[PDB]
Amino acid sequence: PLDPRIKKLLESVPIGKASVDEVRKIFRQLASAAPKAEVRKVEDIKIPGSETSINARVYFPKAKGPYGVLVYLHGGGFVIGDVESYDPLCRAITNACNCVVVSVDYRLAPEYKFPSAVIDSFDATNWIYNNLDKFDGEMGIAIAGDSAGGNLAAVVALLSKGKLDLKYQILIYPAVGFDSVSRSMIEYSDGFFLTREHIEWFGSQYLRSPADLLDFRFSPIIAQDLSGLPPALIITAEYDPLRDQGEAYANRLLQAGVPVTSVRFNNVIDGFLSFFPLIDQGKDAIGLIGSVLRRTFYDKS
Amino acid sequence: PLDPRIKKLLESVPIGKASVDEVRKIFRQLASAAPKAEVRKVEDIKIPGSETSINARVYFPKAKGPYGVLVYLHGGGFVIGDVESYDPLCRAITNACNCVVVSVDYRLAPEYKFPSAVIDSFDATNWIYNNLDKFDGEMGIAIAGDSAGGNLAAVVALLSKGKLDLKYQILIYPAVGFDSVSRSMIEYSDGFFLTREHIEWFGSQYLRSPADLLDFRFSPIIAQDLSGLPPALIITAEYDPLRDQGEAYANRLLQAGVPVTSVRFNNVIDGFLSFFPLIDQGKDAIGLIGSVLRRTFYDKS
Numbered sequence: 001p002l003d004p005r006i007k008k009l010l011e012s013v014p015i016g017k018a019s020v021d022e023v024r025k026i027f028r029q030l031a032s033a034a035p036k037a038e039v040r041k042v043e044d045i046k047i048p049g050s051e052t053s054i055n056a057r058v059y060f061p062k063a064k065g066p067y068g069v070l071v072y073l074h075g076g077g078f079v080i081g082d083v084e085s086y087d088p089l090c091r092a093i094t095n096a097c098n099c100v101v102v103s104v105d106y107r108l109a110p111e112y113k114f115p116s117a118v119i120d121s122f123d124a125t126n127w128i129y130n131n132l133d134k135f136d137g138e139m140g141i142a143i144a145g146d147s148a149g150g151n152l153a154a155v156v157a158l159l160s161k162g163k164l165d166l167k168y169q170i171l172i173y174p175a176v177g178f179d180s181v182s183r184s185m186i187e188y189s190d191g192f193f194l195t196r197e198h199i200e201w202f203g204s205q206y207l208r209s210p211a212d213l214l215d216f217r218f219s220p221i222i223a224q225d226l227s228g229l230p231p232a233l234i235i236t237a238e239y240d241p242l243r244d245q246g247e248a249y250a251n252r253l254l255q256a257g258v259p260v261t262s263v264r265f266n267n268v269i270d271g272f273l274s275f276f277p278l279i280d281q282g283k284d285a286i287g288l289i290g291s292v293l294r295r296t297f298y299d300k301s
Numbered sequence: 302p303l304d305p306r307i308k309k310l311l312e313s314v315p316i317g318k319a320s321v322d323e324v325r326k327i328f329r330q331l332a333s334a335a336p337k338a339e340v341r342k343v344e345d346i347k348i349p350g351s352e353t354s355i356n357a358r359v360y361f362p363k364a365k366g367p368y369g370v371l372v373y374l375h376g377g378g379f380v381i382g383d384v385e386s387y388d389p390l391c392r393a394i395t396n397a398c399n400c401v402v403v404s405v406d407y408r409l410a411p412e413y414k415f416p417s418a419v420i421d422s423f424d425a426t427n428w429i430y431n432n433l434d435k436f437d438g439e440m441g442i443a444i445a446g447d448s449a450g451g452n453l454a455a456v457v458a459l460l461s462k463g464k465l466d467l468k469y470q471i472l473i474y475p476a477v478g479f480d481s482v483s484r485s486m487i488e489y490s491d492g493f494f495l496t497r498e499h500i501e502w503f504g505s506q507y508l509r510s511p512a513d514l515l516d517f518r519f520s521p522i523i524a525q526d527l528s529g530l531p532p533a534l535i536i537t538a539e540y541d542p543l544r545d546q547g548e549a550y551a552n553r554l555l556q557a558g559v560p561v562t563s564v565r566f567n568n569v570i571d572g573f574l575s576f577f578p579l580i581d582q583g584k585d586a587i588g589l590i591g592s593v594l595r596r597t598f599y600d601k602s
């Protein structure tokens with residue numbers, strides 16, 4: 001069953017039942033309420049994308065350099081969330097990993113439909129890779145994101161094959177495609193924060209036509225070839241409609257020879273890392289991310 | 302775990318690794334080896350379809366009429382199987398249900414791609430409905446099929462809404478769409494008779510383009526409206542890549558107010574009813590079908 005702490009929280013975001021502005025506001029005020037841990041320095045930068053100037057926030061850790069750079073792609077169903085609402089989480093990640101985090105403000109639907117978010121996420125990652133020196137970030141680049149952001153991270157890792165050298169991909173309860181059949185999708189369709197109705201709504205805002213459902217840049221699970229992708233940490237949540245598809249992607253990556261640590265956090269829901277001050281499991285997931293990136297970037301415990 | 306009887310059988314059909322002719326032959330000789338139970342009468346008929354003359358075999362039970370008529374759509378991945386290889390199973394069903402069974406030789410891929418099988422299956426069902434008098438079949442019509450045939454049965458039930466009055470749909474370990482994410486698909490991808498590689502091969506032979514994956518006549522799971530469909534018996538197999546999607550369809554039907562008895566036969570695999578002389582669970586599944594149809598057609602135990 002759910003951790004009673006989470007059940008209590010749930011029993012006390014109106015996606016598809018309020019305006020885009022209102023749902024964005026509700027989400028901002030929820031996510032941004034978490035404590036902001038001190039980092040060494042924060043900078044807002046503009047990354048010159050192929051289709052837009054991409055705002056990003058750069059967090060520097062108190063540890064001395066050189067650093068690895070983690071590109072972070074926020075969740076929010078391709079429609080809500082932003083860099084500023086993810087500031088608490090990105091600060092926590094920065095401190096856990098002792099690395100630079102660059103959180104990307106990719107273009108959001110419905111104003112900018114698929115594949116805008118993908119293009120911005122990839123363009124940002126490409127630019128950061130080519131400018132690691134600016135961050136004292138010579139230990140390399142990794143990519144991470146949660147939920148819809150995990151979709152984008154997975155897709156960026158695919159697009160980066162034979163171009164960038166991503167050291168790692170961190171997929172935090174990712175969406176990896178269109179799922180009308182998995183047990184978790186059916187069983188946890190309602191009552192666990194992220195619902196099937198929300199997922200369908202987000203899909204309706206982001207995608208342009210049903211054809212986009214078959215585009216690997218939306219459904220990385222059907223990519224022709226997953227071999228040669230960066231090693232992955234894939235976190236799933238037990239009570240999450242997206243759980244089974246995330247674990248399927250982990251399995252597909254493993255079958256393609258990609259190293260994957262797939263961990264199901266029991267008793268929790270989609271989005272639980274954003275709840276880290278309330279949900280201890282969220283802190284522990286952040287710590288797991290920390291371990292994996294300190295090892296990959298620095299060969300440190 | 303698998304029933305040891307089934308493990309033994311598996312440990313002792315080369316889809317995608319031999320010619321279409323050879324795989325068809327191998328399947329025929331396997332399936333047709335089961336005993337043919339006596340029925341009262343068998344007739345081969347030609348049903349005038351919209352696109353072809355449709356061969357069908359009609360089985361009459363020893364029980365006196367009037368009868369219900371079960372339209373049966375064989376499995377075989379839209380590519381293999383036929384009425385004659387399914388003769389033992391259809392005879393067993395006939396005797397269990399005390400009803401007329403009409404097994405339909407729908408057009409097969411790759412010679413005839415999607416939606417040929419659907420068109421023939423629907424046209425046959427429509428003609429039978431309109432000619433129930435020819436079979437003393439006034440107690441009505443139901444539809445059934447296994448695996449790919451369960452796909453076709455489910456689709457025929459959708460297409461029949463507001464046209465025919467199907468009394469029941471029997472979906473025997475059905476495929477209900479494209480599934481790249483379910484746990485059963487991933488976990489039982491290999492070693493359980495029907496494999497993911499076979500499924501992908503069948504999909505490649507049957508469908509014309511990836512767009513067909515989103516056509517409700519291939520993926521009834523994404524049909525816009527499942528309400529008002531006939532009551533269903535949905536049989537799934539525990540060790541079957543198709544298991545989760547069949548149970549998802551059952552759940553979607555239930556959510557749409559359609560009565561569904563969804564039963565997972567544990568310890569067995571896809572196709573187990575075809576193995577009824579070896580696999581006792583197959584006989585029992587046939588008996589369950591019998592119970593449901595005797596009730597719906599005759600209000601009998």
Ligand SMILES: CCCCCCCCO[C@@H]1O[C@H](CO)[C@@H](O)[C@H](O)[C@H]1O
Binds near residue numbers: 077078203208209210
């Ligand atoms: C966490 C966010 C995950 C979003 C996954 C969306 C899965 C696809 O969502 C779908 O896409 C279609 C195209 O707009 C629509 O026709 C449907 O309403 C919808 O179910």
Ligand SMILES: CCCCCCCCO[C@@H]1O[C@H](CO)[C@@H](O)[C@H](O)[C@H]1O
Binds near residue numbers: 503510
């Ligand atoms: C028991 C038979 C179930 C068959 C389900 C097939 C699921 C879809 O199968 C797919 O369809 C595509 C179109 O041809 C192909 O591109 C792919 O190879 C394949 O995975």
